[PDB]
């Protein structure tokens, strides 16, 4: 079988940069090479085929070059929506095989989060559980610290976080932290607070609410 070796495995670049991604075949495949883009949550999409032909409808900043064993995908002017994983693929011989993929990430300016907090819904409380959600919206870089305080007591062991992939329009992250308690424990305290620390904030930001108000 033909092995396809892609490099680099990942690259961080700025909007407007020229980016090059390489793919090396283990043997000569002439021009039987394609490049695909896989955006988050989506199927791959053909960008370039026959090493250098542009697929209809694909922005022309994506171009390909090379023949034989060494191939290059070029993005001439990187855009935020180019955050994606790119794969080469040979069609010279079955089995058709792919490179391991190159993850493209976008560098941008610092952006402070907007912070929102949600008490549990009355519907959920009826079921016996209280989920309290803290949202950090549209920040950069990804490093962020979320601390839960319940009646000014720092919490540990009862929250989970999830972060989005970089946004396709502004390259920021968003993050949810969910504090989960029994309805009984929830009803034993008044003040629920989410304290956010991030490079874009001069001082930590706290969003809080009093249970039942």
């Amino acid at each position: 079988d033909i092995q396809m070796t892609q490099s680099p495995s990942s690259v961080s670049a700025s909007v407007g940069d020229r980016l090059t991604i390489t793919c090396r075949a283990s043997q000569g495949i002439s021009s039987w090479l394609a490049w695909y883009q896989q955006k988050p949550g989506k199927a791959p999409k053909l960008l370039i085929y026959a090493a250098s032909s542009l697929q209809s409808g694909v922005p022309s900043r994506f171009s390909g070059s090379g023949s034989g064993t060494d191939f290059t995908l070029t993005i001439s002017s990187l855009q935020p929506e180019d955050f994606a994983t790119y794969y080469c693929q040979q069609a010279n011989s079955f089995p058709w095989t792919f490179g391991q993929g190159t993850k493209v990430e976008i560098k941008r300016t610092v952006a402070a989060p907007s912070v929102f907090i949600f008490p549990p819904s009355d519907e959920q409380l009826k079921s016996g559980t209280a989920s309290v959600v803290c949202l950090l919206n549209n920040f950069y870089p990804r490093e962020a610290k979320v601390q839960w305080k319940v009646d000014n007591a720092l919490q540990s062991g009862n929250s989970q976080e999830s972060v989005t992939e970089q946004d396709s329009k502004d390259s920021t992250y968003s993050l949810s932290s969910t504090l989960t308690l029994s309805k009984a424990d929830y009803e034993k305290h008044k003040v629920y607070a989410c304290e956010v620390t991030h490079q874009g904030l001069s001082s930590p930001v706290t969003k809080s609410f009093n249970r039942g108000e």
Binding site: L46, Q100, G101, S121, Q160, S174, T178, F209
Partner: protein, 227 residues
């Protein structure tokens, strides 16, 4: 429009079989091969085989030979991929893709285009469980500088995935649907949020459309400010 629409995600026990379908529309069905490609956790892509829907002939990657069967039903322009004796590392996103021919690289027809949306097959002994959907209501504590945040919490489901749309697809700007977390119970949870003008919470309607296909759960939840 040329499109390939695949069947929904499924959980299957180790040793069982799964049969994924790929409904083609908008092109001459017998005029293109249908290929299958799968994507494991490490996001590598792995070609599985093809079916020629005109002749019915197939060709499978040696890795899946004896375990995969590709078939088609021309009368409903649908292809199928059945993978038997499922094992833990068969957990993957399975894609169908259209390929025009295998002998002329210079044509755009003769590469994977388009692809189906993928079908997540989870190989595990646990039973399917549908999610609960709770509102994340906009309030004074989720309103900063003229913008309000609101959302839906989608809790306690198995296996992945759930999809969330807003207002049946008409609301996409500012939506963030978070990657699922694995709870200690073994069930998944995620939230989907959107930011909107605070000025119009009284006049706009915000409904999250939650789909968990493994359990045939579809939930539309209206999210409104709490009185």
């Amino acid at each position: 429009e040329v499109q390939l629409v695949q069947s929904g995600a499924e959980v299957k026990k180790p040793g069982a079989s799964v049969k994924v379908s790929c409904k083609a529309s908008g092109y001459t069905f017998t005029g293109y091969y249908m290929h299958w490609v799968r994507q494991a956790p490490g996001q590598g892509l792995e070609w599985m085989g093809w079916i020629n829907p005109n002749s019915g002939g197939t060709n499978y990657a040696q890795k899946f030979q004896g375990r995969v069967t590709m078939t088609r039903d021309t009368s409903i322009t649908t292809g199928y991929m059945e993978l038997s004796s499922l094992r833990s590392d068969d957990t993957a996103l399975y894609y169908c893709a259209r390929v025009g021919a295998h002998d002329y690289y210079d044509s755009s027809d003769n590469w994977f285009d388009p692809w189906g949306q993928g079908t997540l097959v989870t190989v595990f002994s646990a039973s399917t469980k549908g999610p609960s959907v709770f509102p994340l209501a906009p309030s004074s504590k989720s309103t900063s500088g003229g913008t309000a945040a609101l959302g839906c919490l989608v809790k306690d489901y198995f296996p992945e995935p759930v999809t969330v749309s807003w207002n049946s697809g008409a609301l996409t700007s500012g939506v963030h649907t978070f990657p699922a977390v694995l709870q200690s119970s073994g069930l998944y949870s995620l939230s989907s949020v959107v930011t909107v003008p605070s000025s119009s919470l009284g006049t706009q309607t915000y409904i999250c459309n939650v789909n968990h296909k493994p359990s045939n759960t579809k939930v539309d939840k209206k999210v409104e400010p709490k009185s």
